[PDB]
Amino acid sequence: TEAKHQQQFFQFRLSGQTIEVTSEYLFRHSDNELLHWMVALDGKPLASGEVPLDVAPQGKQLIELPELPQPESAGQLWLTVRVVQPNATAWSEAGHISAWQQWRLAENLSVTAIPHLTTSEMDFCIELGNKRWQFNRQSGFLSQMWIGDKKQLLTPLRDQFTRAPLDNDIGVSEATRIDPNAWVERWKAAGHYQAEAALLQCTADTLADAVLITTAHAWQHQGKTLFISRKTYRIDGSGQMAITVDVEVASDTPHPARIGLNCQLAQVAERVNWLGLGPQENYPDRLTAACFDRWDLPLSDMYTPYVFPSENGLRCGTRELNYGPHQWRGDFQFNISRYSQQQLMETSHRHLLHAEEGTWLNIDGFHMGIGGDDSWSPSVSAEFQLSAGRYHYQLVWC
Amino acid sequence: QCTADTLADAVLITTAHAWQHQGKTLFISRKTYRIDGSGQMAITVDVEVASDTPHPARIGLNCQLAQVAERVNWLGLGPQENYPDRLTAACFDRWDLPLSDMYTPYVFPSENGLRCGTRELNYGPHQWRGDFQFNISRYSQQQLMETSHRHLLHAEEGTWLNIDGFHMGIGGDDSWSPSVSAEFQLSAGRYHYQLVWC
Numbered sequence A: 001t002e003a004k005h006q007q008q009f010f011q012f013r014l015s016g017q018t019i020e021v022t023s024e025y026l027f028r029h030s031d032n033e034l035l036h037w038m039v040a041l042d043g044k045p046l047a048s049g050e051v052p053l054d055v056a057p058q059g060k061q062l063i064e065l066p067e068l069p070q071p072e073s074a075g076q077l078w079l080t081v082r083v084v085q086p087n088a089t090a091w092s093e094a095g096h097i098s099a100w101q102q103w104r105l106a107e108n109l110s111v112t113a114i115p116h117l118t119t120s121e122m123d124f125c126i127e128l129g130n131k132r133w134q135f136n137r138q139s140g141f142l143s144q145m146w147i148g149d150k151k152q153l154l155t156p157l158r159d160q161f162t163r164a165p166l167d168n169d170i171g172v173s174e175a176t177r178i179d180p181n182a183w184v185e186r187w188k189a190a191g192h193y194q195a196e197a198a199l200l201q202c203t204a205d206t207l208a209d210a211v212l213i214t215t216a217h218a219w220q221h222q223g224k225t226l227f228i229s230r231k232t233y234r235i236d237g238s239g240q241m242a243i244t245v246d247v248e249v250a251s252d253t254p255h256p257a258r259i260g261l262n263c264q265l266a267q268v269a270e271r272v273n274w275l276g277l278g279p280q281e282n283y284p285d286r287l288t289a290a291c292f293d294r295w296d297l298p299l300s301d302m303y304t305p306y307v308f309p310s311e312n313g314l315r316c317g318t319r320e321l322n323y324g325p326h327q328w329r330g331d332f333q334f335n336i337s338r339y340s341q342q343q344l345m346e347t348s349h350r351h352l353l354h355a356e357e358g359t360w361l362n363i364d365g366f367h368m369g370i371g372g373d374d375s376w377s378p379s380v381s382a383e384f385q386l387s388a389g390r391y392h393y394q395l396v397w398c
Numbered sequence B: 001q002c003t004a005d006t007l008a009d010a011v012l013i014t015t016a017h018a019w020q021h022q023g024k025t026l027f028i029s030r031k032t033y034r035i036d037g038s039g040q041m042a043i044t045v046d047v048e049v050a051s052d053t054p055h056p057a058r059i060g061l062n063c064q065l066a067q068v069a070e071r072v073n074w075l076g077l078g079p080q081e082n083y084p085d086r087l088t089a090a091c092f093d094r095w096d097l098p099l100s101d102m103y104t105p106y107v108f109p110s111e112n113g114l115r116c117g118t119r120e121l122n123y124g125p126h127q128w129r130g131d132f133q134f135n136i137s138r139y140s141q142q143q144l145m146e147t148s149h150r151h152l153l154h155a156e157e158g159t160w161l162n163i164d165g166f167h168m169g170i171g172g173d174d175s176w177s178p179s180v181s182a183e184f185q186l187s188a189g190r191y192h193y194q195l196v197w198c
Helices: A002-006 A183-190 A341-346 B141-146
Strands: A010-015 A018-023 A034-040 A045-052 A060-064 A075-085 A096-108 A116-119 A123-128 A131-136 A141-147 A153-160 A196-206 A210-220 A225-236 A241-249 A258-265 A271-278 A291-298 A315-323 A326-337 A359-367 A390-397 B002-006 B010-020 B025-036 B041-049 B058-065 B071-078 B091-098 B115-123 B126-137 B159-167 B190-197
Touching: A010 A075, A010 A096, A018 A034, A075 A291, A096 A291, A116 A196, A123 A196, A123 A210, A131 A225, A196 A225, A241 A258, A258 A326, A258 A390, A315 A359, A359 A390, B041 B058, B058 B126, B058 B190, B115 B159, B159 B190
Parallel strands: none
Antiparallel strands: A010 A018, A018 A060, A034 A045, A034 A075, A075 A096, A116 A123, A123 A131, A131 A141, A141 A153, A153 A258, A196 A210, A210 A225, A225 A241, A241 A390, A258 A359, A271 A291, A271 A315, A315 A326, A326 A359, A326 A390, B002 B010, B010 B025, B025 B041, B041 B190, B058 B159, B071 B091, B071 B115, B115 B126, B126 B159, B126 B190
16 A cells, blocks of 8 residues: 555645645546545544546646635644546446545644552552552552453553564574674664663652652663663543653664553454554554544454564554553554564464464554665664654553 | 642642644643752653644743853853754864853844753753753843844843754755755654753
């Protein structure tokens, strides 16, 4: 789909209220072409239209949109155009989408019963109605969350800096010969897959309306600190737990594959619903074909069955993610599946993968590009590499 | 929003502002102030920028300190004025120049004297730590805007400090059309920086 979007025969420019459609066809007039346009706020359609495309080869057609909606509710207006072929051809059926494009229209910024903290030598417990939160004071992570008496976590929520290596990360390197310049080889040499978290700080403070949990960890490999993560957890009286993450990366360590969180949820749900770029798997350097919208796919659709297993299924630019009873909000990238990154790393064939007990969620503030110029040398461009020393992302869990 | 909470070892002040022009919110800044028992006040700033407003020239803080000091000491890129798209010549080091050296006397006054990549800044008794860009002088941005000649500028009562988490590029391909490259433009919607004052 990325190849399709980059190779499409219609280019689009947005000037104020006017869409300019340029034809890249050299010989044919757009005689089986129809432009559909939609405006949505957060995946909620507000306006929709249709004009017959009448553009000469290598020509232009200016399209005046009607008086567009001016909503007062907060959110980002999105304009999406599509080229749909009404009729059938020898190689396509009726309704075939051949080109598309999305723009951001005017944004409206958002202008708008106490959790009880219990302290023990081993844990930090926060209770708010039927919701409970457990923070292990030895690991410094949220070990468990309760809704009623049902566990929500199989694995604690922990920082993740690695991914199951892609074929581009491996790049010709093998256990026998080894290419020291490959990304996976540099990560293994630096000890990113073997880095151990050391609890630097863990303190809980009860504010006037919320419980504040401040944690700090250092990931070190053989007397060398690679990453430091300082986190804040704020559980308010509305049941929302906002997580603020600040991560420092040593300049002399190789750039990490991701700065995010990973956990194994105890629940398997049939549908994955999210507001963001989709509906297909997309990555920071392969997301032009993805459109911002509200997407609803089964959990199986969120996993890409690559024959050689690796990190897959990531969705970038996601503002809201819903999986069963859990909602995650912010600006993040995520992948969700029944396989863990460790299992994908250790398995060489996709038919040898087994679904695990729950669902593995990988929510990331920042993700490295996947490359693709070649698969024998590193090919991720520098602007897609997590080369900044310090990173920050926020997240809401409710 | 404006709320103060006393933690176990510190005082936490949480504020939120919205900058609006004719019923349109342009920027939202949410801040946290944490004053610990060591006298340090750590400031965390999170700023949202509306995607349909033009990209801001800077995301930072400004104040007028009451003290004029002879020397400006900082650890960062220097010792000359440098900007995000004009800092290759600047070297990271410890620099110590007089306050007059921190102001560039452009004949047509404008924003000037910025130092990027600064981890520590010392001016008199005040130390600022983090990762920021700053300019320091006796002239305010309003005075530089309203004055057309550098000989019509007058030193103000104290010192105007402009500490910035993020600063837009200055351009230079031409001076009749916009020439700042997109990667030097504050085009992200959300920005975050931290700062320590002690």
